[PDB]
Amino acid sequence: YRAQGVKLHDKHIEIVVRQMMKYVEVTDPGDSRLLEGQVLEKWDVEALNERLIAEGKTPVAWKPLLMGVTKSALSTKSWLSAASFQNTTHVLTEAAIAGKKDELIGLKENVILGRLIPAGTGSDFVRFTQVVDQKTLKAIEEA
Amino acid sequence: AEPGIDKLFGMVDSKYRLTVVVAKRAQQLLRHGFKNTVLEPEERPKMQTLEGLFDDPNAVTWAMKELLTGRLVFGENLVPEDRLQKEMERLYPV
Amino acid sequence: SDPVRQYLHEIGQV
Amino acid sequence: FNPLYVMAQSGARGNPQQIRQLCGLRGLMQKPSGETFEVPVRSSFREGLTVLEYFISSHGARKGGADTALRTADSGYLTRKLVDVTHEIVVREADCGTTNYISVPLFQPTRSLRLRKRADIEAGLYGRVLAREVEVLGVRLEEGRYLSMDDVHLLIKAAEAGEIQEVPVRSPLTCQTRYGVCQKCYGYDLSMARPVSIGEAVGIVAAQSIGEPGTQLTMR
Amino acid sequence: PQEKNSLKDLVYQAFLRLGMEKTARLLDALKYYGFTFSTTSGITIGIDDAVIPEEK
Amino acid sequence: MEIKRFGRIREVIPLPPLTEIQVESYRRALQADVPPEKRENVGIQAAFRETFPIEELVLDFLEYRLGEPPFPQDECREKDLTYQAPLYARLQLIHKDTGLIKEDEVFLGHIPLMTEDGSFIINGADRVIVSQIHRSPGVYFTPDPARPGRYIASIIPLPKRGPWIDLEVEPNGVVSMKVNKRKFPLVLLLRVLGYDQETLARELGAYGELVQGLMDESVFAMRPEEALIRLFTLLRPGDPPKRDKAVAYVYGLIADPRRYDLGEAGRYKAEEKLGIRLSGRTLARFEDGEFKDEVFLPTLRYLFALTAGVPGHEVDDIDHLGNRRIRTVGELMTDQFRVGLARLARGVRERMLMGSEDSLTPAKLVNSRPLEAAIREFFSRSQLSQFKDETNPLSSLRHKRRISALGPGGLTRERAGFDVRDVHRTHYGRICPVETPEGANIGLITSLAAYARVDELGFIRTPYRRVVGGVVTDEVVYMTATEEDRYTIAQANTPLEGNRIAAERVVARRKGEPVIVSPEEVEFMDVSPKQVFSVNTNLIPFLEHDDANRALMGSNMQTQAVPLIRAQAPVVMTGLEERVVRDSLAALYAEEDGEVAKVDGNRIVVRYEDGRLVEYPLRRFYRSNQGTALDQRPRVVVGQRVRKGDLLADGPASENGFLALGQNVLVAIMPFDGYNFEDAIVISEELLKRDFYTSIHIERYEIEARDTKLGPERITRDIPHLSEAALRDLDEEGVVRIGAEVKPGDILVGRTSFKGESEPTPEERLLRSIFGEKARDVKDTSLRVPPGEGGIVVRTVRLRRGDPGVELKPGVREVVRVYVAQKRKLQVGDKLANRHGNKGVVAKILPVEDMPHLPDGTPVDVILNPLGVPSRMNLGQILETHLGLAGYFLGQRYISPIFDGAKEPEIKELLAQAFEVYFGKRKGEGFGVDKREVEVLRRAEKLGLVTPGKTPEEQLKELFLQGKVVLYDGRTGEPIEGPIVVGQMFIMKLYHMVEDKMHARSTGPYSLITQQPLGGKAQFGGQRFGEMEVWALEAYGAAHTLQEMLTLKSDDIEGRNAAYEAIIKGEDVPEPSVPESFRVLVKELQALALDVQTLDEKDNPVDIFEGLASK
Amino acid sequence: RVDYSGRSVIVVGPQLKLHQCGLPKRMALELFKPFLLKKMEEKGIAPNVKAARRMLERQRDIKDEVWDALEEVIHGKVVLLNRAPTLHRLGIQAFQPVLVEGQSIQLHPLVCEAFNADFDGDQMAVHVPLSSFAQAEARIQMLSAHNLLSPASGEPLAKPSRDIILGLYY
Amino acid sequence: PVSLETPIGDEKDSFYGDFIPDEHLPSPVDAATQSLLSEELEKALSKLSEREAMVLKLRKGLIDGREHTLEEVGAFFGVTRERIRQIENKALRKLKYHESRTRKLRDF
DNA sequence: TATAATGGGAGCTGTCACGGATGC
DNA sequence: GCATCCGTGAGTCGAG
Ligand SMILES: Nc1ncnc2c1ncn2[C@@H]1O[C@H](COP(=O)(O)OP(=O)(O)OP(=O)(O)O)[C@@H](O)[C@H]1O
Ligand SMILES: Nc1ccn([C@@H]2O[C@H](COP(=O)(O)CP(=O)(O)OP(=O)(O)O)[C@@H](O)[C@H]2O)c(=O)n1
Ligand SMILES: [Mg+2]
Ligand SMILES: [Mg+2]
Ligand SMILES: [Zn+2]
């Protein structure tokens, strides 16, 4: 980008790379129900480990996995988001076999359902904010 | 630019919260026909017509101007929804 | 592959 | 005060090479095979080209048009891929509480150690939160500080003085927020030059910000 | 003299120091005067305005 | 208004007829003017002779004939039918073994006929068959992309006329043939042909290591027929080897002329390449007893020779224009004719087996339908059959000269790479380097060069003058690229004294490479610069000063120029302007010397010298394909004596025979108040006052009244529930009367239609009871004026079911067509462009008093921003402006030919002559130098524009020669601080106009499967909010705006109805609901065996169908 | 595809404030049509809604009070302008509509860089956000004058362009 | 019949069926007109006594599906069939008189 | 409701780039 | 463990 005279902040590319690094590969299952070679999200395996180390069980051995942008997009947890990207057949078949449920965490799924997106003014952080005036505030303050 | 937009952005921790507040307040002003306004007669948003100045029909201009005065209070879990709706429909029926 | 050819082969058996 | 000169210099319109083609020589031309002709175009656009010169030049023009045409689809496709990868990423919370961070180099490996270019350091620093306290040039930049452009220029000045080597910074790479990134790891919302508001959809912004210049990206 | 870069730095610095609104006003003003002065400036392109150097 | 021309160069040959490609191609294909016995066995005759005789009873082919058209061209245009001729075929049915023959002439249906200008008429609409460019048939040798040493041979026939064949020497060390994606040793095939180890090793053993891989003992051990059967199992598994079927298959693959067909060009290329001669167009022969081969052995020879490094063997260039040919309209039509004919033949055999085998005639044995269907298919729906561009004469003329790489057998737009899109060196003089689409089609859609001609073989040839010694002969040779590569060709600009070369060192080309050469070494010379470029490109003066991209834009945009009611040829032409009008058949000319008898707006009657009195009807205000009005106006007066070729009447856009695409306006180049910012243009109202840039546009409206099960749709005057105000402009029969002015909402044609089965709602019935009124059984279907349309009604056509000459499609009672014309003045948002690629929309119309003006009272017409010039690097507009100024004050026009034309000094002289008129008369009028002019002169002195110390007049002349004049601000009266370039530029108004483009919708039609709004202005549809716009909203924080789009503004039914009602009542819009197209997704997913379920937080199902989909 | 959306050819208004755009009257009439029927009923222009709509269905049936009523309708409101392709989020921006005659949309110069629009015949789409929520979102978040800096690099986006720099430099 | 998937243009982006409007489902304007009508007719029947309105609602089908015979309206209210016809006639007269002055039902 | 008739017929080529799996 | 095969997709608008 610098070569062509485009100023672009590193943070964005970092946002993408972060998603490229999202997945890991199991080296040893340990006490888990997992198996050698199985691929899953880094968050899900660390949540598993921190759970079973508190259960006094052997941790799951794993190595980091770098996959490109397309494959990372298709490997997402949400099947509505994956089916709408590409490989509509493969995604749908594997997800329908797995009996997958889409928890609607992202923007795409919510867009397809026509739901309010979980971002901006649809963010739970700002969504439930209420407005009132001192007159009505005191009027309700009475009771 | 919306007048005093920087102060409005100063009022909240997230710009989107400012948006939610303004929008909700505007819905309140629309429901009750402006009877509930925290603006005094001289502060009322005006609109030039053929005959002469009238009250600004736009509820968002209003809501923002009201917000600029400290006369509004916003936040989460201030009042249950029932109490708010009912008390506002009491003091200002429509 | 080529169902007509297949049926025309199965036919040639009898 | 010449018009061509003034326009090129002000930034209104024009660059040195185009003005060169106007008053200078058009320059070397290239075959469809990619190898250049040994015979340059000696004419300016003022003097006017010979029909052979013109024809020799049309190759590069055609290759350029076909290049833009074929590239737009690749840029767009990339953009859509990026959007589908980053879409779920939004600013979910204020702090994930991570003690992790990244360390931004102010120098790069002629084989030696030399300062980077200002533009680069700015593009890696500006509007970010320090993950550790730094003391340089008698100034304390505290942990949690969002670096202003002036904070950056200061850090560069300190690096020129040998006081600072790398700058510790909160980054999306190290952010522990689930299904997104937090406010501190992100830093400024560069559009408002102030810390990002919780709820801004960061992924889409990253994707679009990467993809948009892609049409201007050189070659194929 | 004021070129693309110095005007860009001006707009940015105005954004930082003054408001968003005031920067918008500064923008509108710069637009107005820029156009106004560009009109009467006498900027034009003739064929003789592309000057072949004697060094060529 | 005299016309002065520049340039040294004299053209030894005129441009060929520009439509000759189309016209001559089709003429060769039909052979309609040739008596049958003299026909050449090409095109249609060739297809007939190729299909017949039909074996088994034998049906042979005697001949064919084309009758005259059932209807004339205009009548076909009006009646929405095809201009065509009946095709009869004389055929004899010979019964084998009865010796009996029955001759009959069988009617085959109709073949479309090309018109004078090279276009067609299909179902009433003018069309154009576009020439396709493709890889020429033949034998090629290409470098193997796998390994450096090896090479791959390819044998290519005509596209539908046979399979491709590859020859490759493997790493295995054996020679392999690839056919139908099946690879087998070439050995076996060679053995099939009667070849022996000895015969092969003798000639082909010159290279031993390579030939030893061709040697397989087990193959030569087999009998030739044993090699035949061995091959048949390999090619098609699943079929039994059969001596009857196996020979028949391999014959049809290779030696069959009716199945495998190499082009005549393929034959020639193969012969010239392999140094052999072909007896036929196949790769082998069936001549008894066994198969005999032509191509395979020499192809193998060339392959091995190229492999070893043997001299005289080189790889072919696929993009070379010797290796790429052109299939023109005639060939493309002939192919489909061959196809339909084949289907007809299969039909004939079928009908020949079935039914009585005793009594049969050619009439009973032949079904015309397949052929008719094939031709109609080709013409009506095809990628190469294109709706003709009628916008201006040059539009059509260019459209006919287009060359497409796409189409059937062509490239896929997605898969086209850099190679085919590139301009090859061999494009010189053949395919125009500048003119193509700027978009995704770039390099795929190209244009035929001016002097370029396509030969019998289909290769493009360009003319070159012969040079013997130093002398230039006037004999002209048209060469292919393959031939051109053999010589040294000098540029056309090189100095000549008489026919002798006057240059000691002359610039030339050897195989495309520019080289400086001795006059003794020159074999040939370019005819003209013109031959390098297309017709549109040749119309840009000063082209040498413009970068190729903006030149491309100018070329393309001339096509888009609309005819103006008063149109003028450019003040600076290229000299090609008249010939373009001539060839395009825009205008009307005198056939012989003679005297003009009568002159009318409608007609021109001319008496010739032989006493014959000929009458020429003028086409007046006819609607073109693009809706631009095409009308001829008389250029002569009663009693005027005219010679042969003299102009009788002017074409739709032309001025006195010269091609006029636009207006000549007085421009000032200078920024004006941000109104010209970023390519926008400032226009003076003085242009609208004098009707400059005003054009006529006719639109056609059509309505059908049909027969319904609910009763007839009637077209009448009385429409239920309408005021007299609405019907005041209506005809007594229900139509609108000619001359009326129609505005949006008004009724063009009244139509009543029987209501569907009615289930009156209780409210409706109670209302009826309250008002005690008719409750009519008919509805108003009447065709009204669309939003943003209107004009004066020029014509009406009315066709009814019972009529003397009228046939309608079944169920239709009547058809009514109203024609509505409008006169469009230039308005803000209309697109303007010049020939150098400068384009922009008018952003402002200032009144004359605000306009910049000269020292005398004359205001400038147009103001163009100079900021557009440097980046774009097209300087031709500047020169055109200078010379336009000179020609403005002198009162003359100019011709500057393309690369040979006016230079700076000559223009400077013309500008001096101009200044003498401009400033000179001012002194005699008793006026000196103005104070403002003095100040401006001081500014210019500081700018180094003028020399210090000279008199004011000397300095003003100094500026004027630089093309700059003092200009006064119209608003102020103060002068512009600098002197400004001002002069006449030729600017045209394009077909893109806001009146057409502006569209808006609140609510409207919705689609069937998905309740989403329709697209397009015509359907009154909504704008598209795409994935990227959705991204734009998500990137902002607007959740509610986005959801509102998705749900509320489209595809949510309850939501949209409730929203409209909410706004109508003045209450805020309801919360969004489930989008219908998601339900569509759910059900379309349930059609597949997958089950989709919306759930709670408790993982309990939620019904989004509200119980309607569940028991 | 959505309702309440138009499209037309853009043309530069130099006179507009940064937060404004010119909107053709004929576009505005159709885009805001329901609001206009309502406001026509709020005045003495039409007996009811159906009468008002029946009045707007013909060009010759439109009065002068209709336009002033339209001016009342759009007061304070914003519309979204969009130019294809939209590469980043600034491909859509919010403006206060200023009714202009003629059929062209007037665009402000300083936003031309962000849309990558020029006057060579570019076209733009207009969308009317309906609810108070959508209007608040557009006015606060998407307003042209509220976005002066690139989200990509913190550098300014709306900054003096060609003619403006030209004048100031001069 | 013809295929709704029949290509439009030489690109891959258009189909025949995309140009076919959906007639069946009511328009937002249509639905608004009906919804406004029910309200104006409910406003008009309020000027009537509750019996006049109820008689007129009963036998016009405004309530409970199909219209009722005036013999059935008579058994409902407890009057003679002649009375119900008369109550309907007087109610209609009241509606015509009222509507004549207001002109709010002109939308039909 | 009855001579006997017993294995089809066309095809259509100038991308690619990975990738995931399959096969030496 | 490498050569090969198949399957998938290749920017947006507008108009046809
Ligand atoms: N394929 C496109 N996608 C998006 N915008 C386009 C496209 N084609 C044209 N435009 C827009 O219209 C402007 C000018 O149009 P352009 O000169 O490219 O041809 P056009 O007017 O669209 O159609 P035509 O090729 O018939 O002239 C462009 O600058 C661009 O903004
Ligand atoms: N198929 C297409 C064709 C065009 N476009 C768009 O239209 C513009 C024209 O570019 P352009 O190169 O013609 C003019 P510009 O970019 O302003 O350069 P200049 O003014 O300095 O001379 C592009 O910027 C694209 O956004 C598109 O998206 N898809
Ligand atoms: Mg531009
Ligand atoms: Mg443009
Ligand atoms: Zn974090």
Side-chain angles (χ1 to χ4, degrees), chain B residues 11 13 16-17 20 22 29 33 35 37 46 54 85 87:
Chain B
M11 294 183 184
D13 53 340
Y16 305 134
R17 165 160 292 134
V20 180
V22 172
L29 294 198
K35 309 267 89 267
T37 179
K46 290 303 170 182
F54 271 86
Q85 294 180 354
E87 292 299 325

Side-chain angles (χ1 to χ4, degrees), chain D residues 13 18 68-69 72 215, chain F residues 438-440 550 553 678-679 839 867-868 871-872, chain G residues 83-87 115-120 122 162:
Chain D
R13 195 74 92 122
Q18 305 182 325
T68 316
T72 315
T215 73
Chain F
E438 195 189 357
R550 286 288 154 168
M553 301 188 197
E678 276 291 3
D679 307 341
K839 63 185 175 193
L867 276 159
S871 165
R872 280 65 176 273
Chain G
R83 179 190 171 274
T86 97
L87 307 186
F115 287 102
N116 191 70
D118 51 40
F119 307 94
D120 57 25
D122 281 39
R162 337 215 160 272

Side-chain angles (χ1 to χ4, degrees), chain F residues 526-595:
Chain F
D526 299 9
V527 168
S528 202
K530 314 184 192 307
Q531 74 174 106
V532 180
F533 310 105
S534 64
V535 164
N536 305 65
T537 313
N538 262 290
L539 287 172
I540 315 176
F542 301 115
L543 176 66
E544 65 274 12
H545 306 278
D546 303 326
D547 191 293
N549 305 263
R550 286 288 154 168
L552 158 146
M553 301 188 197
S555 298
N556 288 326
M557 285 191 303
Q558 293 193 260
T559 309
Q560 308 174 16
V562 300
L564 308 172
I565 54 180
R566 35 177 42 190
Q568 49 200 99
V571 287
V572 182
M573 292 165 298
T574 59
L576 199 60
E577 290 71 10
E578 192 158 342
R579 183 67 190 283
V580 169
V581 171
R582 181 62 62 106
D583 284 7
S584 68
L585 271 128
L588 180 77
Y589 302 96
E591 178 188 347
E592 294 291 325
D593 307 90
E595 184 178 358

Side-chain angles (χ1 to χ4, degrees), chain G residues 32 34 37 42 47 58 62 67 70 83 91 137:
Chain G
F32 292 95
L37 302 185
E42 296 184 36
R58 294 174 66 179
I62 309 177
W67 302 120
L70 182 61
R83 179 190 171 274
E137 279 177 340

Side-chain angles (χ1 to χ4, degrees), chain A:
Chain A
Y1 282 100
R2 288 165 196 165
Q4 271 53 78
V6 174
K7 196 176 179 184
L8 174 64
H9 197 292
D10 289 12
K11 75 205 297 181
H12 304 297
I13 312 177
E14 293 171 1
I15 297 290
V16 177
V17 172
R18 164 188 179 78
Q19 296 297 100
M20 291 191 252
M21 303 289 307
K22 184 163 64 169
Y23 302 104
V24 302
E25 172 184 330
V26 162
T27 40
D28 166 274
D31 286 326
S32 62
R33 193 179 151 269
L34 275 49
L35 27 148
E36 174 188 328
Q38 178 176 326
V39 165
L40 35 67
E41 303 190 8
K42 187 175 59 64
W43 179 274
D44 287 327
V45 72
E46 290 173 353
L48 170 64
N49 280 5
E50 290 195 350
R51 176 166 70 90
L52 49 70
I53 61 104
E55 201 176 12
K57 309 291 289 299
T58 68
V60 173
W62 58 264
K63 58 188 301 185
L65 189 52
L66 167 72
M67 53 180 61
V69 127
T70 304
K71 189 194 177 188
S72 178
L74 289 172
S75 299
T76 189
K77 183 146 56 190
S78 146
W79 66 265
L80 265 166
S81 172
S84 42
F85 176 49
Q86 253 186 194
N87 289 77
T88 318
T89 292
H90 184 63
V91 171
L92 285 179
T93 63
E94 289 200 341
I97 289 178
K100 284 197 175 186
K101 308 172 190 178
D102 199 317
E103 297 291 339
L104 312 182
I105 311 298
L107 302 183
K108 288 191 64 175
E109 318 90 298
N110 293 272
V111 161
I112 303 180
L113 301 196
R115 303 174 85 240
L116 202 84
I117 57 175
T121 54
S123 179
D124 289 343
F125 190 78
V126 306
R127 185 173 63 156
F128 299 107
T129 309
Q130 276 168 335
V131 201
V132 85
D133 43 315
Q134 277 292 160
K135 181 173 296 182
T136 309
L137 184 64
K138 199 140 56 183
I140 309 180
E141 186 72 37
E142 290 180 351

